[PDB]
Scaffold this active site. Sequence first.
Site, PDB file in Angstrom:
ATOM      1  N   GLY A 219       0.806  -1.209   0.140  1.00 16.91           N
ATOM      2  CA  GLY A 219      -0.148  -0.086   0.077  1.00 16.91           C
ATOM      3  C   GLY A 219       0.845   1.145  -0.010  1.00 16.91           C
ATOM      4  N   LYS A 220       0.605   2.255   1.131  1.00 19.13           N
ATOM      5  CA  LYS A 220       0.976   3.461   1.029  1.00 19.13           C
ATOM      6  C   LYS A 220       1.674   3.914   2.476  1.00 19.13           C
ATOM      7  CB  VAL A 221       4.077   5.219   4.289  1.00 18.16           C
ATOM      8  CG1 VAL A 221       4.343   5.971   5.411  1.00 18.16           C
ATOM      9  CG2 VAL A 221       4.312   3.605   4.568  1.00 18.16           C
TER      10      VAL A 221
ATOM     11  CG  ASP B  31      11.637  -7.377   2.434  1.00 17.48           C
ATOM     12  OD1 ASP B  31      12.138  -7.460   1.426  1.00 17.48           O
ATOM     13  OD2 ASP B  31      10.522  -6.583   2.499  1.00 17.48           O
TER      14      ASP B  31
HETATM   15  C1  LIG Z   1       8.205   0.844   0.207  1.00 22.25           C
HETATM   16  C2  LIG Z   1       7.985   2.539   0.752  1.00 22.25           C
HETATM   17  O1  LIG Z   1       7.868   2.526   2.073  1.00 22.25           O
HETATM   18  C3  LIG Z   1       8.018   3.709   2.550  1.00 22.25           C
HETATM   19  O2  LIG Z   1       7.875   4.722   1.925  1.00 22.25           O
HETATM   20  C4  LIG Z   1       8.000   3.730   3.877  1.00 22.25           C
HETATM   21  C5  LIG Z   1       7.990   2.778   5.121  1.00 22.25           C
HETATM   22  C6  LIG Z   1       8.096   1.118   4.752  1.00 22.25           C
HETATM   23  C7  LIG Z   1       6.946   0.343   5.351  1.00 22.25           C
HETATM   24  N1  LIG Z   1       6.501  -0.418   5.986  1.00 22.25           N
HETATM   25  C8  LIG Z   1       9.216   0.768   4.280  1.00 22.25           C
HETATM   26  N2  LIG Z   1      10.014   1.180   3.334  1.00 22.25           N
HETATM   27  C9  LIG Z   1       7.782   3.293   6.259  1.00 22.25           C
HETATM   28  C10 LIG Z   1       7.911   2.844   7.585  1.00 22.25           C
HETATM   29  C11 LIG Z   1       7.910   3.554   8.667  1.00 22.25           C
HETATM   30  C12 LIG Z   1       8.050   5.008   8.617  1.00 22.25           C
HETATM   31 CL1  LIG Z   1       8.018   5.944   9.938  1.00 22.25          CL
HETATM   32  C13 LIG Z   1       8.082   5.644   7.351  1.00 22.25           C
HETATM   33 CL2  LIG Z   1       8.117   7.337   7.094  1.00 22.25          CL
HETATM   34  C14 LIG Z   1       7.845   4.586   6.174  1.00 22.25           C
HETATM   35  N3  LIG Z   1       8.024   4.858   4.720  1.00 22.25           N
HETATM   36  C15 LIG Z   1       8.184   6.137   4.299  1.00 22.25           C
END
Ligand SMILES: CCOC(=O)c1c(/C(C#N)=C\N)c2ccc(Cl)c(Cl)c2n1C
Length: 332
Positions: free
Chosen positions: A27-29, A142
Amino acid sequence: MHLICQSGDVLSARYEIVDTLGEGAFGKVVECIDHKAGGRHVAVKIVKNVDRYCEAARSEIQVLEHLNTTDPNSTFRCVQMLEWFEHHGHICIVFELLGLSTYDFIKENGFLPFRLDHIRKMAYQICKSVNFLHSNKLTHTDLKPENILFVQSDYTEAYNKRDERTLINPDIKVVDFGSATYDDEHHSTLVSTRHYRAPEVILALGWSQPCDVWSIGCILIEYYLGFTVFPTHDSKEHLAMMERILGPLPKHMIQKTRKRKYFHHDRLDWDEHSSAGRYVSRACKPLKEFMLSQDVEHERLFDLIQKMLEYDPAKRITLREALKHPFFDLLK
Ligand SMILES: CCOC(=O)c1c(/C(C#N)=C\N)c2ccc(Cl)c(Cl)c2n1C
């Protein structure tokens, strides 16, 4: 997903979306203002309403509840979950806000590698963080640059070849615990797509914490070069690349594996003159030929990388051992 994650959307009558931080398979963050926590900015992981992904999100919540109780001061740099909730049927996980992933940073820096002094600091944190998971009977599974996030990704820029961005503070945290598995849990013997799969995963020989070490070795090479030394999605190609970079697979692993599809007699069933073969010959070479300098700190880094990329997961260095490696003596 499009319908529930636009700026100005309010989640759980509490979290106001101000920005999208990233998108992944799950999904999305998004970045939100928390209106019941004084306007604190938080990250919110918005998960696809798809069985596979909901399952993974419930699992990540259980892991993160365990980690955050075990390490309430975040001494070991795993992302801190604040709470979770449901929104139009989608699982939403709230996190302390972090910065850009290491992957995204390299991308926005024209695939320029990190400076060795920053690699040493980041490597040490990643090792200590993942070693904490290993100490609590967990395997991440991962690890990749996209799952290592800078706490704060502000940078400065200067002419070097070209112009470069340099982090002001390279502190990181480890994120994405949707695949993390406990020792006494069922281990996915089919591991799915991964940036960097260990040989024991490819060969279905069984995996546990050593597969994290392999991934970390690969991360470190990618930080040093700006790009992966295993530019492939295909498992047999991946093995072919391993042999070019690290030498022949050990006989004992070839003997044990049920993945006979990859083999013909004692050896990898690989046509060096095919499309994929010609590319592998071009793209890959022995590990130490990737070194950009012969200086001793580079030799120190590459010695650690080679130990982390030991084929046999029993013989492979543990994170506890890696933390004692000479590469890290400058941080002492
Ligand atoms: C695969 C893209 O995931 C993210 O963009 C991501 C992700 C993830 C997940 N799950 C993995 N890169 C984040 C996890 C915790 C926090 Cl605080 C932030 Cl800001 C996260 N972000 C921006």
